[PDB]
Ligand binder design. Structure first.
Ligand SMILES: C[C@H]1C[C@@H](N)CN(c2ncnc3[nH]c(Cl)c(-c4cccc(C#N)c4)c23)C1
Ligand SMILES: C[C@H]1C[C@@H](N)CN(c2ncnc3[nH]c(Cl)c(-c4cccc(C#N)c4)c23)C1
Lengths: 288, 288
């Protein structure tokens, strides 16, 4: 990035605690020295012969995002062979951090979370960006009960992988048009995030995504078959007909039929009148 | 290990190198002579800490193919960080070597070649392999007048990429089925080879594939536009309706409507009565 600060981040922040890692890098809870504001600092170790493409793409996604439901970006620092990405800190951590203590979320809490995720996805999709890693661990909650999407690590890697494809595709004159399309634009589109939101809604209701206890490779193979059936909520009576229908239309097996994020925002479950941060403040009270 | 049947010896103890033939997708190919048999072979030398995945898959393809329309495989050598793949020497070289000397092939000669290539492709596709690099340079003619497919380097690179993606795909529970499908099977299928054979038939007719004078990046981007129209033969009157139709159907833009190799074997152009090795023996006589 051409706007990177060439100075030690510790000159502006104090490192408080290690939070663990995302798709790549180490994340730290830190404190701004002038305002006391907390921030998250993501550190990625640099090496002289490292391909900078993925990190360059992640910073570009964060920098060009300007939406409430996506983690704010405060700049990046490069110092002593370490890159530090400065992002918004969310006091309650991720929804996975929360439901591991509280148990299942209520339908209204899930509905508010889904509307907030959809506002962030509609924005990302309008800027020709894809998250590709929607899940409870990447949906953060701040102390005010507001929802923010985090970790554009997978998105950055895919973007870099795609740029690499274009650079080594070779002579194209004998290449079929579908081979060219997958090299330039990949084998899928942004509607994959709508499916992941549907799986995330089930995860918030049952504490695990569908088939979580079966081997990872077996799930990938079963999903690729023509007889694959989209998952459903286990307890039928516990959830309203509008929630079951939200799962059925987000989890549409075919991407050509799957509704967009903007279309999903007018769905009854998330366009309901009593949806606000107060529902998540109630969940956070259960945590304390 | 790159190959369990590999010879840990200097191939120069068994072969005399006679001439540099040029390169394939990777490696350098030499014409060589067996010191005891007197037989001619082609030796492909590749410099090999290196990941042996693509060379391992190329040898496996060559080794497990038992077909009259695929270049014969003799064995491999590993000596002083160089891997040497020993394959059949095809006396007339590639179809590109032939048409640049003799000019455009006759419609019957192109028909015979297309039939032979389709037989090799139907065999390869039945064994779950994709060539992905069908072109005049990779179709060889031996002294017996036989048509043999060559250069599985691209196919090996693609198999190595599909294995490298599956190992690093991560947790799949939140992935849309189409995402799981491009990670395990890619965004296209074996029908890409049928399109490449259509382009090759135009290359044998016109001495260049369509749009050869257009910038490679322009050709690629043009294939991803909604109104994209597949290429055709430039000289209508020179070719019969059977050849125009062969081009029309092999170059079907949608892979869902493009016929398989086995289906193409019943096409009017390649099911014609006088398609025999005599046409290729006659082409070879013209080279001398
Ligand atoms: C590594 C995560 C473990 C999770 N338990 C707590 N995470 C957070 N908590 C509070 N504010 C935060 N801001 C940001 Cl951004 C993150 C975050 C969350 C997820 C991935 C990445 C990245 N790349 C960063 C975060 C950090
Ligand atoms: C590099 C090619 C240039 C072309 N002019 C003549 N080629 C051949 N000629 C005679 N017998 C041959 N056997 C085999 Cl295999 C090849 C061959 C052809 C194409 C690619 C590769 C590879 N990887 C090997 C070959 C060699």
């Amino acid at each position: 990035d051409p706007d990177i600060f060439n100075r030690d981040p510790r000159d502006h922040y104090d490192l408080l605690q290690r939070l663990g890692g995302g798709t790549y890098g180490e994340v730290f809870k830190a404190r701004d020295k002038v305002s006391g504001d907390l921030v998250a600092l993501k550190m990625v170790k640099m090496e002289p012969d490292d391909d900078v493409s993925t990190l360059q793409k992640e910073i570009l996604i964060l920098k060009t995002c300007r939406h409430a439901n996506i983690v704010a970006y405060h700049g990046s620092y490069l110092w002593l062979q370490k890159l530090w990405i400065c992002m918004e800190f969310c006091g309650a951590g991720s929804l996975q951090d929360i439901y591991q203590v509280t148990g299942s979320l209520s339908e209204l809490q899930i509905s508010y979370v889904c509307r907030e995720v959809l506002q962030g996805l509609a924005y990302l999709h309008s800027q020709k960006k894809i998250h590709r890693d929607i899940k409870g661990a990447n949906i953060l909650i701040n102390d005010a009960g507001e929802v923010r999407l985090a970790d554009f690590g997978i998105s950055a890697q895919i973007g870099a992988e795609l740029a690499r494809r274009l650079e080594f595709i070779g002579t194209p004159y004998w290449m079929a048009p579908e081979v060219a399309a997958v090299a330039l634009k990949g084998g899928y589109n942004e509607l994959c995030d709508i499916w992941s939101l549907g799986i995330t809604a089930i995860e918030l209701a049952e504490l695990q995504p569908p088939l979580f206890d079966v081997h990872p490779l077996r799930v990938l193979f079963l999903m690729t078959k023509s007889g694959y059936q989209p998952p459903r909520l286990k307890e039928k009576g516990k959830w309203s007909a509008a929630f079951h229908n939200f799962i059925k239309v987000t989890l549409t097996k075919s991407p050509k039929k799957r509704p967009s994020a903007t279309k999903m925002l007018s769905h009854q479950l998330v366009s309901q009148p009593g949806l606000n941060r107060g529902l998540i403040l109630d969940l956070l009270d259960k945590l304390k």
